[PDB]
């Protein structure tokens, strides 16, 4: 399983003032731990 | 203008024309609007 | 160099693999632990 | 067998409230190929008709394309068309009170399926 | 004039052999912009009905969205839809024999055309 | 859930003057999908069909699927086809003289929309 996020033009991205690379790297980095995270609690709270 | 083409072989010169298609504005893909370069060619004959 | 190198795309990718632990006979002879969740016990409440 | 053929094409969804108005749903550009113009009624409308057309992106060159009344919900434009200038989908509803029979708003979703006016050459 | 559209297409097409019975012919993910649902008979069918609709992954939720008697032999959805937890698209044949008046089995095939749930953002 | 689905799509666009003949208008791969052909008729004619249908790169096996009158002036199929050896989509036209009540040429405009036989196979 996967995410991934695309940019906008670089020139929009240089002049809105964000560093895609590195926030998208961090937003993916913890959207990773919440998902493995519901797959744990998902398998551990299916049928009892 | 004297064609420096010795081996007396029809000649085809051709010629590159000017962009005159609009382009892609802002965050708008390239795809949107691809251009087309256009080559123009003419052929010179021999006569005897 | 997604668009023409214009923008980006950040991916992130898991492959992992998770169960409840539930074990089931090797044979066809009827152990306790058969069906049975290894370890877990479900408690279940209104939530309001 | 060699043509050339349009590769990239674009969906717009566009949802408006379905009361009286003018909206601007979709934007186009010049070229575009649009292939497809839905529209549909998300509830039980009690009176009032969608009209769907094309308008300048400034000046009142409105022109209705597809007319919806209340019954049938849902509709298609039964033609084809290359985009010359008319750069916006625009809807209006001349008829409409509020929601009607439900109690919770009448929505309307328009959906376009265009193709940008870039062309490849393909041999087949 | 800027907006966000679905930039992503998918078609999927899937036979069935018209008899009796439910199949899964298309699977959509959530978010999904389904703008085409079309079947087709292929044969020539005797008696029988088929109902092609939307149902869950797992649980019984099935509701026909076109009917089609034997006579037209082909039929598409009049509306469009978006993916909500509905990610089957199902058919059922509830009366049908062997093939007839042809001795040759008869066919049914599904094209479904459907925009994926990513977007992009585009100015014109 | 999980499928094979056509991921590339094109959109073909020809335009011939409507009068008397055979016109080759859209090219087609082996295993396209082809969903969307419609006919446009871009003035106002005053007698004759547009007869559009499938036949061979070569040889003379020509079909009408869609028949239009002069009255209605845009048309598409009802029907959707998978390319078996039918490569060519061509447009006759049997009946037509000047353009008629217009004084200017009357245009007949042909989009097709069809998937490539490419699969990709995805899961929801």
Partial sequence: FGNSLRSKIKAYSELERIDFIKESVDSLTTWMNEERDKRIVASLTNDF | ??????????????????????????NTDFEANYDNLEILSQTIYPDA | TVDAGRKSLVGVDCLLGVSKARYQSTDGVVTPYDNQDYAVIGLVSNME | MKQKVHSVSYLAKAEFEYK??????????????????????????????????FKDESKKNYSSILTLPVNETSGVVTKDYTVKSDKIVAAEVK?????????????????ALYFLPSVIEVEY
């Fill in chain 4, 20 to 53: 009286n108005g003018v909206y601007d749903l979709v934007a186009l550009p010049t070229g575009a190929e649009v292939i497809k113009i839905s529209l549909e009624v998300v509830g039980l409308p009690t009176a009032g008709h969608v009209s769907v057309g």
């Fill in chain 4, 95 to 111: 008829d409409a009170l509020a929601e009607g029979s439900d109690g919770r708003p009448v929505k309307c979703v328009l959906r």
């Fill in chain 2, 1 to 26: 203008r004297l064609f420096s083409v010795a081996s007396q072989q029809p000649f085809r010169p051709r010629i590159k024309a000017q962009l005159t298609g609009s382009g892609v504005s802002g």
